[PDB]
Symmetry: C4
Subunit: 387 residues, 4 copies
């Protein structure tokens, strides 16, 4: 049965550890893909980790040069949550160096972008069969979420970008039904920049929190209904969510320029005027992770907050993070439950290896007791192949 | 359908070998997790082996230092009984350095504790979805069975301990329904010590046989009904069950102080005034294993027994042991069948390696002919990684 | 339910990338079969890659000498599309050094040829059970498609060749029902040569495009109805499809003798007088791959064409290619969708290794936007075993 | 639904190759169990290979000394037919150094013998649950078929031996229902010797062809009905079936003394007065394999035969062989189809290695065209671990 997606997001006071794969530790000997850009998505029956492989295994010579983002060898694959991504346990999804995926309650939708930078093509699959494609409309790296799309009542929604990563680009919202693009809208967003959106359903509407790689240290957001009527803004909290970013201070409802260039994929959950912000602990590099509840941070610009929970230590590597939800159809609850994942990036450019790869952790929102700690990647670098 | 749990334990005259995984032997070459604290639990359709990984594989450098009990890398995972615990065949359950699991007849309950020693949190999952959490109440290594919880009529039961491992601690019993704690009781047990309980259902009541790490070389027990009304005692038999222990003498109905400090997880099955006792063969180390039937050993203090069956030879490594049961809903019998498993610990601290890991064997009680033998681990240490 | 096979081929404007397995890159470390002659075939539920193993893994000494085509160690196996062919994820099909397979909508049919060159036997299995055999009738390497057979209304069809690969041979067409040969016909085709046919259903009739290894650098074809009444010809286009071949010039409706000796397995899709041709980029070796639409190339001899889409760059290795289809029963479309795969051959005879193996890519035809690129094998040769 | 087992054995004129696993070649790199005593058995849905592992993988140090027959590390496991026996694709069955298994149409029965030579215990499991045990009655290596048991009308039948392998021993036939022994009879067979029976159903009765290890170079047989009323004899053919054996000459309907000591597990299929005999090609060692049709060989003593089909070349290693059948419930045929497997033994005692392991091939009987060839193991010895 189709996910209804019409209930509200469950309010939560804390985050309980849900999974840890130890991928890089295990890949030191085991046959584990070199990956990056992992994300989690759930069906009414199961949660899966999706990821972009480099078409190579850890500790093998073909992991050489895997700091490179886009190549014909990259593929979107998936495995059950918490298991290491191996050629022996992973399902093939598509050929992709940028991707998204989500389940509408009936079948998996996957979106995999491959091809040259000047003419990339997103291939849409529904239940593993090609159902549609869309080609680059600005000829400058067509790219998408690197996290799950959001589903409401049999329609799935995603955001794609085409154009400069360091200046004004073009941003489109899509509605997809059974793998067919049935509507798209280009956002009219002058002076905004959207990359790598983390999108979730909440009361039949979609909220996306994204990355301004151009000139924003706070995160831009876009919200829309099923007809793709939309609103845009930036998270106002002085608790800045991007990385890099400046010191916390008075915020802005527009892009905060200071340290605004570059960024990292991230997420936040809106609750009225309040916001749960996940972010790195460092203002300069992808180190640490923490969750912060700011009760008026969606719309208010002060840097006060009410709850902070430690997730990864400042002296440990982190990386991308993203939202995922668990629908009532899966959980039996009366609301849509918020969860998130964190990518723990190891290797280049911060460490002296020939490769770059990630492992992952994830957490789900609860209203019972939780504890801050650090659950880092834990691998000992360099590896044999690096010697 | 819910497991009734209302029939009695099958009377058994001996133990038939059920499984052996040869994990450490296989892990010399194959990709096998470093694990400890394995245990078995059954649904109405299958038996699974659960275990706490160290987030590392045997014969890899990340196995270095795995004598260490608690870290953020440890995860509870499971695989089909008798198969090696591998990243290619194991299902992820929970992030955990202490755990329990059982099946109510409908879905799996797992309990996984992680976090800092001074503020750990147990995460409960029902069918893999987080359903409850509970925080440490003594701030000193919140910890649980390391074997299966027990289920009666749709409720599951477990025991957790928090506080000193070398003096009076705090012991709680829980009733859990669909992964939610619906009642807990703190045991009023001054001068008793309970760790790592092996609990089983019998005529709608739960009996747990546990480990006194403080000052008892005989095993403490707690029995309770579905309302958590409980009774406590120590096994009276002069056939002492813990390790270390003194040589068999006249026993006691309270804790036997002689060699009472420290211990090993173990189990026993009560039959009226009699008891089936599983224990190491050595009185000083985790070597050997044997099953002993003492017809008056639950309540009586002499050291006379009438059946002894060899399981692991005295010159071979053993370790933890625990009960599991097979319910009528699985077996088609008219009673609950008692079974047990033994963990065979290899590596530190007794052997010259950088790592510690275990393999397992298991047996089921029958009333047909059986035989004693020795079914040891059989790996040849040290391994390549140790040289 | 049986595949009807009565609708027409979907007209297509381009080819969207569907799968890429990265087998050779991954097999540098992981346990991946040495294979050649892969192909894809679909059921109403799933698509699988079939392949002929060499009974050996990459980077192991038993890969030595695997340039050799026929041995008793070769087996037909299959795995899900896009996954690497590993002993841990592959289903065994048959013992075979030449093969075909297809699904009639109810069960898989496989055809596996093994035995001596002077008396080989094809073993037919339906749902994994042996249902028929046919022995060599010319005693000179009985051999078959190395791609999927074609099914219409509960009957499946294939072509086999027996006799010289450098001169006139004998060619038979078979109708197979539930794994039993129910009719066969020997083609009367003087001066034709048919090897390794790629056959697809289209409006209840079968069209095969094959390899002339004797004296044609264009491809021979045969089409037939369910009663095995047949027509024969060569693709007339001056855009020659075989490898090796001459530079494009005026074509022939018979075999083009210029550079006509030898060849490579290939395919083409007929649309009226037009043809989609897949071919290598190099005229002299198995390098590069491209798809070309020639609006009058089935029957016209000019070398003019409308569309070209790049698949593999001319400086990268390619190899065999073949057609596969996805029926309406799988896709929900009102027509039969054409797709194709390409084998990317690495090792001998072109590279300094002891072994020969391939990886694969595949594409499906669509009417939405697509893009040419190069999706090559990507392995770095030689491997450890070659030193 | 229960297998009826009431139709006759299909008459067959030749043997078509069914499977080949290449286990030893693949295990040179991949994670493949050291095994011996493989056998095949089918359910109404699938065919599986069963085997006795040595609790160790190929090319690892724990494969040392695996010439040894009985140890506590040996386990019965199974995998789909034609797949390599790996810890990643194998199902655990039982702890066993002698075994049998068969499917009654409803569930798998496995029988696994372990324990000391003077008191071994067979453990019976039905659907993986222990259902019965039987202990040694002569205290001298209780042992069984090492091939599939035979099922008729919901009852399964096997033969076990206890006592000397070089003189008169004790042989029992068992009827088993839902894993419970419901009847047994001790065979009154002075001067007969029965080891390692290959038994098959045929028209509601069971026929077993076994190994005389005491003083016969032809094979003993026993036939019985569902009530365990039985008859005994030896295959009369002068085409001697055992290994070692003398050169063919006039046979005996009793044990042929010449070269009678020792032997190898094998099989034969009775058709009236005639017999299909599978045997090694060498009269002195386990080399080569061939199928021979002797139209009066069940009952007549001449060495005349009418068909011979080569299976393994005389210069190649062979080993155990055994029957298995495919019932009408699986095949859709109106008779019971005879098939057989051959174990190809590599390593000790004939080759310079520290280990012994086998691969397997299998064939099914057909009435269509077939061919002889050699399908040998193909591994290159010694392995890395041997050097
Ligand atoms: C296991 O861990 C120990 C550290 O706890 C490693 O020993 C160290 O090796 C480094 C060289 O990288 C030396 O500089 C240190 O002095 C060593 N420490 C100690 C306490 O000896 C050891 O190499 C590890 N073994 C592995 C990874 O195989
Ligand atoms: C091309 C712009 C884009 C978003 C800013 O770059 C991303 C930077 C990422 C990063 O900052 O780590 C890595 C991503 N793999 C990459 N995406 C693509 C499609 O290459
Ligand atoms: C902390 C007390 C506890 C019980 C005595 O210690 C156990 C001793 C065990 C042991 O005796 O081998 C190892 C266990 N993994 C450990 N449990 C935890 C949670 O670390
Ligand atoms: C025997 C003739 C045949 C077709 C021309 O050769 C093929 C050449 C092939 C090739 O050109 O690469 C390799 C094939 N495996 C081989 N087929 C067999 C059965 O050996
Ligand atoms: C103990 C007698 C028996 C049959 C003659 O020996 C067999 C000889 C076999 C052989 O000849 O290769 C190997 C078997 N694994 C062994 N069976 C057992 C249970 O050890
Ligand atoms: C341009 C093209 O591809 N189509 C040509 C057409 O224009 C031309 O008349 C014909 C003969 O030259 O060949 C074809
Ligand atoms: C959500 O949708 C379902 C299906 O229509 C409906 O029954 C339910 O009332 C809705 N819940 C809301 C609106 O919160
Ligand atoms: C990685 O690539 C660099 C540059 O091509 C090369 O010099 C180096 O040898 C490579 N390292 C490995 C381990 O392949
Ligand atoms: C959801 O979709 C269904 C089916 O298309 C449609 O009929 C209905 O209007 C929608 N329901 C809600 C709650 O919007
Ligand atoms: C156990 O409970 C079941 C379900 O109520 C019942 O059918 C059965 O008779 C009970 N057995 C007892 C009370 O011993
Ligand atoms: C078992 O559970 C059912 C449902 O809650 C209840 O009605 C019944 O009384 C229970 N039996 C007991 C408590 O023994
Ligand atoms: C294909 O066959 C089906 C089933 O007979 C039929 O319903 C359909 O009309 C056919 N399609 C054609 C002839 O195009
Ligand atoms: C491959 O085979 C050749 C010829 O027999 C042999 O000389 C060579 O050593 C082999 N190479 C390997 C790595 O086995
Ligand atoms: C398809 O097959 C069925 C069963 O033989 C037959 O009745 C029907 O006429 C066939 N349709 C055709 C030939 O298109
Ligand atoms: C075999 O037994 C079945 C009943 O179990 C009967 O219907 C059939 O006629 C018998 N004959 C065969 C198929 O051998
Ligand atoms: C196997 O054991 C033999 C005899 O003890 C010994 O000579 C040899 O070194 C061992 N080999 C390995 C690799 O364990
Ligand atoms: C199988 O056994 C019993 C009678 O002995 C009964 O279920 C059935 O009639 C039998 N079927 C036969 C004789 O094939
Ligand atoms: Ca930014
Ligand atoms: Ca605030
Ligand atoms: Ca103690
Ligand atoms: Ca006593
Ligand atoms: Ca040619
Ligand atoms: Ca043209
Ligand atoms: Ca003999
Ligand atoms: Ca004769």
């Amino acid at each position: 049965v189709k996910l209804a997606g019409n209930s509200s997001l469950c309010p939560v006071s804390g985050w309980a550890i849900y999974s840890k794969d130890n991928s890089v530790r295990i890949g030191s000997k085991g046959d584990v893909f070199v990956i990056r850009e992992p994300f989690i998505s759930c069906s009414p029956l199961e949660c899966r980790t999706f990821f972009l492989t480099q078409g190579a295994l850890l500790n093998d010579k073909h992991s050489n040069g895997t700091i490179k983002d886009r190549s014909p060898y990259r593929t979107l694959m998936s495995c059950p949550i918490g298991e290491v991504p191996s050629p022996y346990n992973s399902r093939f999804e598509s050929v992709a160096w940028s991707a998204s995926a989500c389940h509408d309650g009936i079948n998996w939708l996957t979106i995999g972008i491959s091809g040259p930078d000047n003419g990339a093509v997103a291939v849409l699959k529904y239940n593993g069969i090609i159902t549609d494609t869309i080609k680059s409309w600005r000829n400058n790296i067509l790219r998408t979420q690197e996290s799950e799309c959001a589903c409401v009542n049999g329609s799935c929604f995603t955001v794609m970008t085409d154009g400069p990563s360091n200046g004004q680009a073009s941003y489109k919202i899509f509605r997809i039904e059974k793998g067919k693009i049935v509507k798209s809208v280009e956002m009219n967003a002058p002076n905004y920049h959207y990359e790598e959106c983390s999108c979730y359903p909440d009361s039949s509407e979609i909220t996306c929190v994204c990355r301004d790689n151009w000139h924003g240290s706070n995160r831009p957001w876009v919200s829309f209904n099923q007809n793709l009527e939309y609103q845009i803004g930036y998270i106002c909290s002085g608790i800045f969510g991007d990385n890099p970013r400046p010191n916390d201070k008075t915020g802005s409802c527009g892009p905060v320029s200071s340290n605004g260039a570059n960024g990292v994929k991230g997420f936040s959950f809106k609750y009225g005027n309040g916001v749960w912000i996940g972010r790195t602990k460092s203002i300069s590099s992808r180190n640490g992770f923490e969750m912060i509840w700011d009760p008026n941070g969606w719309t208010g610009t002060d840097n006060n907050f009410s709850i902070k929970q430690d997730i990864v230590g400042i002296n440990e590597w982190s990386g991308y993070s993203g939202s995922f939800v668990q629908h009532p159809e899966l959980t039996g609850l009366d609301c849509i439950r918020p969860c998130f994942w964190v990518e723990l990036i190891r290797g280049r450019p911060k460490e002296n290896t020939i490769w770059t790869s990630g492992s992952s952790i994830s957490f789900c929102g609860v209203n019972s007791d939780t504890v801050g700690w650090s659950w880092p990647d834990g691998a000992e670098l360099p590896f044999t192949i690096d010697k």
